[PDB]
Symmetry: C2
Subunit: 378 residues, 2 copies
Amino acid sequence: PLIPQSKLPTIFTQMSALAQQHQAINLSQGFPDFDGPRYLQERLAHHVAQGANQYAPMTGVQALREAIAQKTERLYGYQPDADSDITVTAGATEALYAAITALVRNGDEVICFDPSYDSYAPAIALSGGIVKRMALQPPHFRVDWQEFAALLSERTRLVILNTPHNPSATVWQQADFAALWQAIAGHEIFVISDEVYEHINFSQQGHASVLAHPQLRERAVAVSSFGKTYHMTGWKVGYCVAPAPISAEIRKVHQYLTFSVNTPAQLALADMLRAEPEHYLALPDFYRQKRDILVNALNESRLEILPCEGTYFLLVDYSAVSTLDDVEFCQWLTQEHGVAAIPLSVFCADPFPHKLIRLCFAKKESTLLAAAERLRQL
Amino acid sequence: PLIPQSKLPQLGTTIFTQMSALAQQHQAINLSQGFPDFDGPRYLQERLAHHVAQGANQYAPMTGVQALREAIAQKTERLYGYQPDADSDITVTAGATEALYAAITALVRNGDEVICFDPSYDSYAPAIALSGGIVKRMALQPPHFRVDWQEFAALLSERTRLVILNTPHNPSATVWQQADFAALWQAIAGHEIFVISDEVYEHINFSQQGHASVLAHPQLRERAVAVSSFGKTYHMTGWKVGYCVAPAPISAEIRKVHQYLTFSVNTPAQLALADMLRAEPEHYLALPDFYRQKRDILVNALNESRLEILPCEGTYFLLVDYSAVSTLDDVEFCQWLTQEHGVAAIPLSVFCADPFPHKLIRLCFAKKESTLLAAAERLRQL
């Protein structure tokens, strides 16, 4: 038995096991416990039946890329080229890995922000990139542009940002993108904007996308996730929008990663985009309702809430209630009050000196109400 | 305007989409496409809809749905005589393509040398390059494309880290026998050389002994990765669901990569496939006879044409030598054939990194009887 030497030297699985062993309300898992639109499900079955089950084009089904182009135009006032700027991928996860892999060379420095979604770091490492982390500080987790400016070097190749922000639930304002552009304008720095929660922004101001900034747009990759937008994360279909030159390099990697993406699913997704276009304009109110169920319960609790601007996650400060560290507090919470959450420390590379936990409210009303009742015991 | 330097200034192919475009322009029988022109099993499609309807549409486990991994485990045991561990040895991926990229990315470090065999499936090389690995090619020779073990031994070095073999072999339609795997073990037994066996066409082996898998060899097994594709087996290439079998330690590393590649794969599809595996195991057991019938339609047709055929031992591809018909190189010949005789084929030279001094073209017989009969009637005129 020959053993490989890892080129990359379980939390989410503990919580669901502890939540199961103690019948705790699951608010840790970052996906819905309700299903998606059946129109989409119905169109999938229709395309499978019509026999559209063989390889799809490498860049994605034509109808889908064109439908995505139109959506982009309606939303951000600019129309990408459907044949060269849009690429369908097996989930946003693959788009991120493809974009990162296409842009990061050995020794390149990539600026990221913590707390962070855990998939960026590994991809950057597999391409031999160096991660430079900015530690966003609670409660507002705003980007300290002066700290940012200091992280730049001649090796800075890419900036990966996530907005709305998982796990902090904060969002980037138009002004933040303006500041990013002012900071990287004179440098050869690419931008990857993880905007999978693009339709879950509670500001009246609306979602501020990198695609709305004319200059950043020409040097950036926007990543979206259908699984996240249509409440069906297991469908694994996403895409990225980027200038032709950049999308071309994303495609070179993608083509050998998976080559093509589930064909029926794509056609179904195309139908959904064309049949119910204003569908996402409703998601903000849809999730704001769910968010408040948890917020109102926590206002009668010794637990404190941080402002939730986006994503379907919420941050809670348990200082007044306990002295334990977040990881073990969550274990205590699950075991003593039947509510499972995720400690914010698992999203940080370096020590996080705070008493914050992440709660997901992308759940059925009954789940949120049951959670609310238990949160009110603290 | 920012333009990225490509990590792959490696000019890439459009040979397949171009042949199809030429075929439709001249309404030619398209035998160049490496996928069915008929649909998959109805039961599989039904079960997909069933799981979608039952709400099984959220993230599946990172290593794949538990039920699919066990069904694969018991299938492996029945076929090759050994039962892998369902939890640690099997990993579901979004197509064999991702299983290959993941396995290759997890084992190839910068500078590592990987031995490959031409003619070759075009996805191995680029994945190796992205990990900074060095490709060392063996040029299998017609008519039998048998491995030259002396040539192989010569390619080995202290930097050889991996051997990628594809059996049944696309595009040569040849296969590895039990003795070939025996030879492989003898050749690499003393070095830190891992093996990746692309066995997507494992259920399309026309041998009397049947498909010889790397998984059937006790020693090669604990240092190898077998790659499978459900899309190939169930005639629905667009479903993109594959997997790889490897020892816990190797799977552990494949998984570390896969997890950040796609993380999880279409959940309802995985459950649908598991049902298909448990419910109708006979579907793959009858695939050889199913394809031998389609193959023979082409074999008998050209048995009077002046074109010659080489032995097709596996895959749903067939090699045709056109020496007695034209002096054109294979690329110009396939164009001429599509335009003048209405039958689209793929030149074998596009599958080779180095010059291929032969007049061979690849035909795909994974087509409806009506498609194969029409092609047969046209190939007759040569």
